[PDB]
Amino acid sequence: LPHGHMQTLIFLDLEATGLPSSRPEVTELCLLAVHRRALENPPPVPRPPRVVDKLSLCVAPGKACSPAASEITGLSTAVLAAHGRQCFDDNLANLLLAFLRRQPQPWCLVAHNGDRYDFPLLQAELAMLGLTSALDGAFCVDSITALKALERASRKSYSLGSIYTRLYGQSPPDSHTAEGDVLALLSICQWRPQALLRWVDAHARPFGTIRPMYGVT
Amino acid sequence: LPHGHMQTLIFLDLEATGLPSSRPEVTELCLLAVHRRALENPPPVPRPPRVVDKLSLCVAPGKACSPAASEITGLSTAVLAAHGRQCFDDNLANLLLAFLRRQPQPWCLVAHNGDRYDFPLLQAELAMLGLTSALDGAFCVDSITALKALERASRKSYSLGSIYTRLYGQSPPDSHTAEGDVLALLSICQWRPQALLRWVDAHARPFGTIRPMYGVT
Incomplete structure (x- = not known):
């Protein structure tokens, strides 16, 4: 394990004004x-x-x-x-x-598509304030990559709703609100909890290595 | 209005190890x-x-x-x-x-039975840390007193579950968890929102006048 066993999983979702570009x-x-x-x-x-x-x-x-x-x-x-x-x-x-x-x-930190969206955006907001290393003590994983590895270990979409519906037979309640998406992600991560923890421990990435979506690097 | 119109209502619930004594x-x-x-x-x-x-x-x-x-x-x-x-x-x-x-x-701050429990307990925890005036900028009301005035303006119990059941015909979902009790209190305060706001504005009490349940005063 690169950084030992993760003690706390902080499921995260960011909603924003638009797309990365x-x-x-x-x-x-x-x-x-x-x-x-x-x-x-x-x-x-x-x-x-x-x-x-x-x-x-x-x-x-x-x-x-x-x-x-x-x-x-x-x-x-x-x-x-x-x-x-x-x-x-x-x-x-x-x-x-x-x-x-x-x-x-x-x-x-755990976020769906976090490597492409949530993590760079959070780093960008912190970078605009000059707090470039504010959350450097944390680690992060993308639950899209995690759930791909779990399901393939036993073409599908690996969006939040696709995985949730595929596992539980219904769509998540409060879609596209920050709290609703986090609670749906928690429910999916509880599908195979021990297998998720093994994958998270092996793939935990220092948040400081996340490049900001924009702003100073 | 003693302190003008309140802009933000912060519904609050504290769970603890026991009763005040x-x-x-x-x-x-x-x-x-x-x-x-x-x-x-x-x-x-x-x-x-x-x-x-x-x-x-x-x-x-x-x-x-x-x-x-x-x-x-x-x-x-x-x-x-x-x-x-x-x-x-x-x-x-x-x-x-x-x-x-x-x-x-x-x-x-808005809390059910807050004058007897939630507000003095929060002040007590802050007092133990020596942060006696940490939340002095806030005001507070007890929603038991508020809902009594609203219902009587048009014997009943004025507990959280009694009012909720009396208004909506069912018990609140997550009883006796901090978030569940806050969400149930919000639903009750949304019954007559304008009448509640009038009562809150007239009865807003400075949090600094709340004596701590224990500790230095």
Whole structure:
């Protein structure tokens, strides 16, 4: 194991104003911290663990949401401003780090398509604030890569809804809201928990090696 | 209005090791921040607003949970320790304040039986850390007093489950978990949202006037 056994899996999802090439900005985020103990034990959807830490926040972006983004997430810059949401700032970064500091280390962020979207976007927002190494103590894995390895070890789509529906026979409840996507990802990761933990431990990647989607590197 | 219109209602619930006379310690907490805009519009349960901030955390108490507490909340000091939960510390207090700083002011904490339990207990945990004025910028109301005034304005129990069942014809889903109790309280406060906001604005009480359940005053 490159960095030992991960103690806490922090399932993560970011919603934003658009796609990577549009220089997107976070509109919503959810972090759900689950200790390794909770993952050490047609079918029914597994129940979430009793002991979990959860953080869900809406963020006012510095730009307009694309029509597709508002259609998908139900959020817009006007709606976020009507609720007095604040931009991505130092206080938000301090909040995220304080949330992670509640969790036993090593931390491992888990996000669906995180290597291409969630992780670079989070690094980009931190880079704009000059907090380039704020979350360097954490590790991260992409659950798309994880679930591909698990299912193939025993063509399919490996989107969040495709895997969820393929395993449990129904679509996840609250699709394309940060918390709903995190809870659906947790349910899928509870399918084969021990096999997931083995894969996460072997593929845990330092968050500092994640290049930001934009901004200084 | 004593302190103007409240901008953000932060629904709050604390779970602990026991009753006030036992010097209880927090085992779980949930904060759900809802801007006033979201409350400005047999019956079905109202849907929660799209734009909400949520924080749910489990806390390792410095003592054992009473059998009744573990029976009710599903938590115990051993279970919390098995998941590596940390005690109520400076980092947790910084986290709570950073969460509130995401919300437009004035802040108004809302808790069922908060005047007798949730508010004094939170003040007690902060007082043990010497952070006696950490949340002094916030206001607070007890939703038991609020819902009594609303229903009487048009003998009943005014417990969370009694009001919820009386209004919506069923019991709340996740009873006696911090997040479940907060979501049930939100649904009840959405019954007559405009009347609730009028009552909250007139009865908003500075959190600094809340005496701690124990510790230095």
